[PDB]
Design an enzyme around this catalytic site. Structure first.
Site, PDB file in Angstrom:
ATOM      1  N   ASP A   1      -7.034  -6.363   5.163  1.00 60.79           N
ATOM      2  CA  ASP A   1      -7.112  -6.438   3.239  1.00 60.79           C
ATOM      3  C   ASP A   1      -7.573  -4.525   3.331  1.00 60.79           C
ATOM      4  O   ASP A   1      -7.006  -4.709   2.489  1.00 60.79           O
ATOM      5  CB  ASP A   1      -6.902  -7.303   2.420  1.00 60.79           C
ATOM      6  CG  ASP A   1      -5.926  -8.404   2.888  1.00 60.79           C
ATOM      7  OD1 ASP A   1      -4.856  -8.511   2.551  1.00 60.79           O
ATOM      8  OD2 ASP A   1      -6.337  -9.813   3.821  1.00 60.79           O
TER       9      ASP A   1
ATOM     10  N   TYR B   1      -4.065  -2.314   3.632  1.00 61.70           N
ATOM     11  CA  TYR B   1      -3.415  -2.273   1.993  1.00 61.70           C
ATOM     12  C   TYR B   1      -5.056  -1.273   0.699  1.00 61.70           C
ATOM     13  O   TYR B   1      -4.442  -1.001   0.180  1.00 61.70           O
ATOM     14  CB  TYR B   1      -3.501  -3.863   1.517  1.00 61.70           C
ATOM     15  CG  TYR B   1      -2.701  -4.323   1.724  1.00 61.70           C
ATOM     16  CD1 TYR B   1      -2.446  -4.589   3.491  1.00 61.70           C
ATOM     17  CD2 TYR B   1      -1.085  -4.718   1.917  1.00 61.70           C
ATOM     18  CE1 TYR B   1      -2.013  -5.791   3.938  1.00 61.70           C
ATOM     19  CE2 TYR B   1      -0.754  -5.088   1.963  1.00 61.70           C
ATOM     20  CZ  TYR B   1      -0.381  -6.254   3.582  1.00 61.70           C
ATOM     21  OH  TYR B   1       0.461  -7.152   3.944  1.00 61.70           O
TER      22      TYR B   1
ATOM     23  N   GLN C   1      -7.879  -0.920  -5.074  1.00 58.76           N
ATOM     24  CA  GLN C   1      -6.424   0.037  -4.874  1.00 58.76           C
ATOM     25  C   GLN C   1      -6.293  -1.550  -5.866  1.00 58.76           C
ATOM     26  O   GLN C   1      -5.620  -1.076  -6.404  1.00 58.76           O
ATOM     27  CB  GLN C   1      -6.162   0.266  -4.426  1.00 58.76           C
ATOM     28  CG  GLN C   1      -4.798   0.902  -5.005  1.00 58.76           C
ATOM     29  CD  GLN C   1      -3.424   1.761  -3.438  1.00 58.76           C
ATOM     30  OE1 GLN C   1      -3.885   1.150  -2.373  1.00 58.76           O
ATOM     31  NE2 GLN C   1      -3.009   2.559  -4.013  1.00 58.76           N
ATOM     32  N   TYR C   2      -6.387  -2.502  -5.565  1.00 60.17           N
ATOM     33  CA  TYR C   2      -5.973  -3.302  -6.321  1.00 60.17           C
ATOM     34  C   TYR C   2      -6.373  -4.323  -7.269  1.00 60.17           C
ATOM     35  O   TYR C   2      -6.132  -6.037  -6.860  1.00 60.17           O
ATOM     36  CB  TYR C   2      -5.348  -4.452  -5.362  1.00 60.17           C
ATOM     37  CG  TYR C   2      -4.022  -3.920  -4.760  1.00 60.17           C
ATOM     38  CD1 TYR C   2      -2.689  -3.272  -5.258  1.00 60.17           C
ATOM     39  CD2 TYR C   2      -4.416  -3.351  -3.648  1.00 60.17           C
ATOM     40  CE1 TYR C   2      -2.337  -2.645  -4.641  1.00 60.17           C
ATOM     41  CE2 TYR C   2      -2.699  -2.797  -2.687  1.00 60.17           C
ATOM     42  CZ  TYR C   2      -1.631  -1.701  -3.727  1.00 60.17           C
ATOM     43  OH  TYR C   2      -1.384  -1.686  -3.383  1.00 60.17           O
TER      44      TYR C   2
ATOM     45  N   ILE D   1      -4.100  -9.255  -3.856  1.00 60.04           N
ATOM     46  CA  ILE D   1      -3.291  -8.544  -2.857  1.00 60.04           C
ATOM     47  C   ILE D   1      -1.826  -9.599  -2.501  1.00 60.04           C
ATOM     48  O   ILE D   1      -2.442 -10.864  -1.880  1.00 60.04           O
ATOM     49  CB  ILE D   1      -3.775  -8.943  -1.528  1.00 60.04           C
ATOM     50  CG1 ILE D   1      -5.048  -7.856  -1.754  1.00 60.04           C
ATOM     51  CG2 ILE D   1      -3.077  -7.820  -0.558  1.00 60.04           C
ATOM     52  CD1 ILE D   1      -4.909  -5.863  -1.869  1.00 60.04           C
TER      53      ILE D   1
ATOM     54  N   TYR E   1      -2.568 -13.753  -2.997  1.00 57.03           N
ATOM     55  CA  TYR E   1      -4.153 -14.106  -2.577  1.00 57.03           C
ATOM     56  C   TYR E   1      -4.807 -13.058  -3.550  1.00 57.03           C
ATOM     57  O   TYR E   1      -4.410 -12.503  -4.211  1.00 57.03           O
ATOM     58  CB  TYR E   1      -4.590 -13.763  -1.357  1.00 57.03           C
ATOM     59  CG  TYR E   1      -4.578 -15.233  -0.116  1.00 57.03           C
ATOM     60  CD1 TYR E   1      -3.714 -15.344   1.285  1.00 57.03           C
ATOM     61  CD2 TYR E   1      -4.985 -16.178  -0.820  1.00 57.03           C
ATOM     62  CE1 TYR E   1      -3.546 -16.359   1.331  1.00 57.03           C
ATOM     63  CE2 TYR E   1      -5.114 -17.390   0.081  1.00 57.03           C
ATOM     64  CZ  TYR E   1      -4.715 -17.131   0.940  1.00 57.03           C
ATOM     65  OH  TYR E   1      -4.169 -18.375   1.600  1.00 57.03           O
ATOM     66  N   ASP E   2      -6.164 -14.046  -3.502  1.00 56.40           N
ATOM     67  CA  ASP E   2      -7.190 -13.484  -5.047  1.00 56.40           C
ATOM     68  C   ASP E   2      -8.569 -13.749  -4.260  1.00 56.40           C
ATOM     69  O   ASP E   2      -8.983 -14.904  -3.759  1.00 56.40           O
ATOM     70  CB  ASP E   2      -6.739 -13.934  -5.942  1.00 56.40           C
ATOM     71  CG  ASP E   2      -6.018 -14.627  -6.704  1.00 56.40           C
ATOM     72  OD1 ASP E   2      -4.778 -14.725  -6.279  1.00 56.40           O
ATOM     73  OD2 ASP E   2      -5.017 -13.147  -8.012  1.00 56.40           O
TER      74      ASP E   2
ATOM     75  N   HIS F   1      -8.596 -21.658   8.099  1.00 55.14           N
ATOM     76  CA  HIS F   1      -7.649 -22.782   6.775  1.00 55.14           C
ATOM     77  C   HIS F   1      -7.190 -23.449   7.243  1.00 55.14           C
ATOM     78  O   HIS F   1      -5.557 -22.713   7.485  1.00 55.14           O
ATOM     79  CB  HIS F   1      -7.525 -21.807   5.696  1.00 55.14           C
ATOM     80  CG  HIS F   1      -7.319 -22.144   3.951  1.00 55.14           C
ATOM     81  ND1 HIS F   1      -7.102 -23.602   4.230  1.00 55.14           N
ATOM     82  CD2 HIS F   1      -6.961 -21.258   2.762  1.00 55.14           C
ATOM     83  CE1 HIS F   1      -6.713 -23.716   2.554  1.00 55.14           C
ATOM     84  NE2 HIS F   1      -5.994 -22.724   2.708  1.00 55.14           N
TER      85      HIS F   1
HETATM   86 CU    CU Z   1      -6.488 -18.371   3.529  1.00 56.93          CU
END
Ligand code: CU
Ligand code: CU
Ligand code: NA
Lengths: 620, 620
Positions: free
Chosen positions: A290, A294, A298-299, A371, A374-375, A584
């Site tokens: 990320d 990415y 920027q996000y 992104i 996801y946050d 996760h």
């Molecule tokens: Cu996750």
């Protein structure tokens, strides 16, 4: 005045003008990264020279360039043409993301795949994802994105509930060609919706929650000067913002009596990788960098008062460049506030009759980025007692797949027919240390168990051992929770009043590191993530654990190449790189929108002060 | 009305009368423990019978007794004489603390040791400490305390700054004899004071802190009925209080739609041990069982509004018995409040255009105890998303010694000549589980790494494995942070909508367990502390991991004895015992009063719910 001030809109416009005048920013050029360079080592040095680093993409296919500009002097300092097949592609451009779904909607192979599934192309969203480096020789030197499809039943529908499994496409976003469409078979598209604002799903909203009001009647206890310099409860620091790294902390120091004592020169999250653990060919390439691919700054979200940040909030609104060099403000992108943090110290003494209680508080500096699905929230905390802590908060919508009939060893079931592949979220914190100055060393501290016998006749003694890391080749370390392993950063030339070196202790959470096979593409590209702690000698150009150009870059850059220099790190200007992350295995409770989970690390004083630093806190 | 209501002053008064008339509470008798017994297992239990368990000490030397009385019916149910050389001594009485210092003040050996050191006996405080079981055959069957000395220069002075090393005394508090005085040599008494309210030490107090006002203008969101029954944000529970364990949580359940679903039947901290790791004979015997030997509930603090508990606070004031059977109220001994807990869930979706943010909250139930130099806060948290968490906060004044010339491998230096021996603080949480009912089982979950090869051609896959613990002999488990090890408590007979057993996952902090040699006295008496997780089959009389009578018990009581029954725990009424602790190498910043450090554990739902349980939380 301060060299560490945030970039201004005028500075970004001036960079645009300088690049245009130099012939480097014609209509076929796009700015893929623009950021301010930190001052080089040297007290005072050049008085005032604000320099910017720019990565310039060319949409006609010409070689991109890396350019350094002096906004103060109006000059290009250097410009180098990049050979991307060797050193890596530039970060993904926002405008390239839109290209993928559009190109696929006119490709006969894509349309045939959707027709086989009775899907309307107008309802199919495509998630455009970074490509990595795998077995496709035609991708070397090309800018590739890979696309995975999701169905959106109506414009406000959560497409993540409806993955189209068995299908993936690869797209050259410069030549606008679909290179491959891979269809491994039709899976049912999960039909249940995941619309977490639909009353049919939420039920009636709770009426039971009474308000919690947090106010500061006399205003906050911190001051902001020069736009981004913070003073709070003896702490001093500058809050920077970079489009790649996000919030960056500079010049963290603590006022101890008359003396401003440095602690950390620069702290940032210098990379974050999200590797997926599903061996299906539809997703086995999926790894998000990320930060490096990415650019998380920027996000960044605009944070809403009362919802995202609660209390007496002070905002910063950082300025970044768009793809053409125009300044863009991220309104209310950084929240700053102090928070009560319970009891600081307490004792009721029988013999003296004195009862003593003091309360703790922390300063919070945070931003949030989004992104795709996801946050992520990034939180830095400073506490009254000298503790520094970072916390990442992960939320958003889990990435989904079909759930195979018969089950899976690598995917959780969330709803009928709906799966969520196993994955990790791994961060790299880069801590350019400056404990009481720049002459620092790292010691690994383990608990030592002792055997019952002479000098320990009752078998109760235990101890600890510290090992100094003296060279970079021995400074790649693993966690060991069972031995209570921590790392101490100390200054051997600055002693406390007991004649011991001053230090800070790093406490890790000891979560698993990268799980992928060591021979995999991702283990080579994210080598930093395979070990918990790295120490390097400071160097101006050693900024990221993955190197400068991460997108579609094989191994060969980043931390493994830095430590090969085997530099002296015993009482030198050093940088600590700490890997930490979440593993996760999605649960049903993560669906259809995930409650926050957290991971982080903290640093605590270890004989830095001559006694508790919070004896002068008043009783309220 | 509820069988789980707090003991009332009237109930304790009635117990005193029943004991008196039965002839069991004469002038030589002392109550060392009194507490209400939980109702026995019975899903149709209706007839109210409030029963109290009492430990009766005799100061003239007669055998102590364990007595059970029925307050409802006014009768003694059973009374058993105890053989303490066999089953252990009764807990330490508050009135026995004073006796140690007074007896030593007239002992010629003690006075001669003080005279050599030019110490005024009137200024020498004696910390009365539990004895344990070591090499002294004459102590078997007698109530022994050991004493260590500290100098108080004036009545308000912190005596902990002035340890008198090289000196220890053993005392029989029933026969009032000093059995041994051991003088191993003269150490300088550290001279610096540690008075953290002395302006000479604090310097000028800060004027920089501005107030933080936390209010609830409509009152709190929880209700309290029947004195101690809490309802808050779908949670339901009863808050108990026991003089040994402190706050106990009963009947923890979650209202899921129209169903009240049990989660935990009883949660408590059932023991806590503080073993010291200094091999000096002055301290090598030192191990506090704060719960089992001292009773942490009887030293609970009255908590002050705005200092100890900030916000809209609801207090409970539990009642305990003094040594003669009179009720004593601990005013404001338990604080209950809710607090904001940041972001609960957040996502900004590009495709749907929906921006969604919700805030989290937790319910806090806490108390604070003071045992000599140490102060401990016990915090239970309930979160909106179903998470349950415990946190212990350790503060107070560290226990001190001389710092030897030439240094030490087992003691930290805090100030000139002032040492602090290494030690641990280890807790045992007893969780009588009831996940959707009493048919539960425990699985150990490890991450599984996979090798690159067929079916995993890119080397990215990883997985997990679960192992059911089926008998007590295989249910003594160790942490493994490197493999991400957690434990799942599930109900195999209650499935979620995906046809998977409902469960909760226990997340440990993976801190070191007991460090002492396995052959030591402390490893035998605190065997629970040598392993991270134990699972037993529920039994009425298996209450504490160290047994009923911890003081001067020779070892093996509690969990090792229970586990030896090797009972079936696969889909049965089970109890989880989790060991967790802090390993404390004292730092200079811990002196003269130590900033809070924390340890704990949490439980998170794992397919307990059919989707996120917080979809009905409003925006506010
Ligand atoms: Cu996750
Ligand atoms: Cu301690
Ligand atoms: Na450095």
């Amino acid at each position: 005045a301060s060299p560490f001030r945030l970039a201004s809109a005028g500075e970004i416009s001036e960079v645009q003008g300088i690049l245009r005048t130099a012939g480097l920013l014609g209509p076929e050029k796009r700015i893929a990264y623009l950021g301010v360079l930190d001052p080089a080592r040297g007290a005072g040095s050049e008085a005032e020279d604000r320099r910017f680093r720019v990565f310039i993409h060319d949409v006609s296919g010409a070689r991109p360039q890396e350019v350094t500009v002096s906004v103060t002097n109006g000059t290009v300092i250097s410009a180098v043409e990049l050979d991307t097949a060797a050193t890596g592609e530039l970060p993904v451009l926002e405008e390239e993301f839109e290209v993928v779904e559009q190109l696929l909607a006119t490709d006969e192979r894509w349309l045939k795949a959707l027709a086989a599934r009775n899907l309307d192309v107008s309802k199919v969203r495509v998630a455009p994802l970074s490509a990595g480096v795998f077995e496709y020789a035609e991708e070397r030197g090309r800018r590739i994105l890979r696309g995975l499809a999701f169905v959106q039943d109506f414009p406000e529908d959560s497409a993540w509930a409806h993955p189209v499994d068995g299908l993936v496409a690869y797209v050259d976003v410069v030549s606008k060609e679909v290179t491959r469409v891979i269809d491994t078979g039709v899976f049912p598209v999960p039909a249940e919706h995941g619309n977490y604002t639909d009353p049919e799903l939420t039920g009636p909203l709770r009426t039971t929650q009474k308000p919690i009001s947090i106010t500061q009647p006399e205003g906050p206890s911190f001051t902001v000067t020069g736009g981004n310099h913070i003073e709070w409860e003896k702490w001093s620091l500058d809050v920077g913002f970079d489009v790649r790294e996000g919030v960056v902390l500079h010049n963290i120091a603590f006022r101890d009596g008359d003396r401003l004592r440095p602690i950390i020169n620069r702290a940032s999250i210098a990379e974050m990788v999200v590797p997926y653990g599903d061996p299906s060919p539809i997703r086995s390439w999926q790894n998000y960098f990320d930060t490096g691919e990415y650019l998380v700054g920027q996000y960044a979200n605009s944070l809403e008062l009362g919802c995202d940040c609660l209390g007496d909030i002070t905002y910063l609104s950082p300025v970044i460049s768009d793809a053409f060099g125009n300044p863009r403000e991220i309104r209310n992108g950084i929240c700053m506030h102090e928070e009560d943090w319970g009891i600081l110290a307490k004792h009721s003494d029988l013999w003296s009759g004195i009862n003593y209680t003091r309360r703790n508080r922390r300063m919070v500096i945070s931003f949030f980025t989004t992104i795709g699905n996801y946050d992520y929230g990034f939180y830095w905390y400073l506490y009254l007692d000298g503790t520094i802590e970072f916390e990442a908060k992960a939320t958003g919508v889990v990435f989904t797949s079909a759930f195979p009939e018969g089950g899976s060893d690598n995917i959780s079931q969330l709803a009928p027919g709906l799966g969520a592949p196993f994955h990790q979220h791994i961060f790299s914190a880069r801590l350019d240390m400056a404990i009481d100055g720049f002459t620092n060393r790292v010691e690994e501290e383990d608990v030592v168990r002792q055997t019952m016998g002479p000098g320990n006749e009752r078998g109760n003694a235990f101890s600890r051992k510290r090992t100094v890391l003296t060279r970079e080749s021995e400074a790649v370390r693993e966690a060991d929770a069972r031995t209570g392993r921590t790392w101490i950063i100390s200054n051997p030339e600055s002693k406390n009043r007991l004649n011991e070196p001053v230090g800070y202790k790093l406490h890790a959470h000891n979560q698993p590191t990268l799980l992928a096979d060591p021979g995999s593409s991702i283990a080579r590209r994210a080598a930093f993530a395979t070990k918990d702690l790295w120490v390097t000698r400071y160097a101006d150009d050693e900024r990221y654990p993955t190197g400068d150009f991460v997108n579609q870059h094989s191994g060969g850059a980043g931390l493994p190449s830095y430590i090969a220099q085997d530099r002296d790190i015993d009482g030198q200007d050093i940088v600590v790189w700490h890997t930490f992350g979440l593993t996760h295995f999605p649960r049903v409770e993560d669906w259809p929108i995930m409650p926050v989970d957290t991971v982080g690390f903290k640093l605590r004083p270890e004989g830095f002060f001559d006694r508790s630093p919070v004896l002068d806190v008043p009783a309220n």
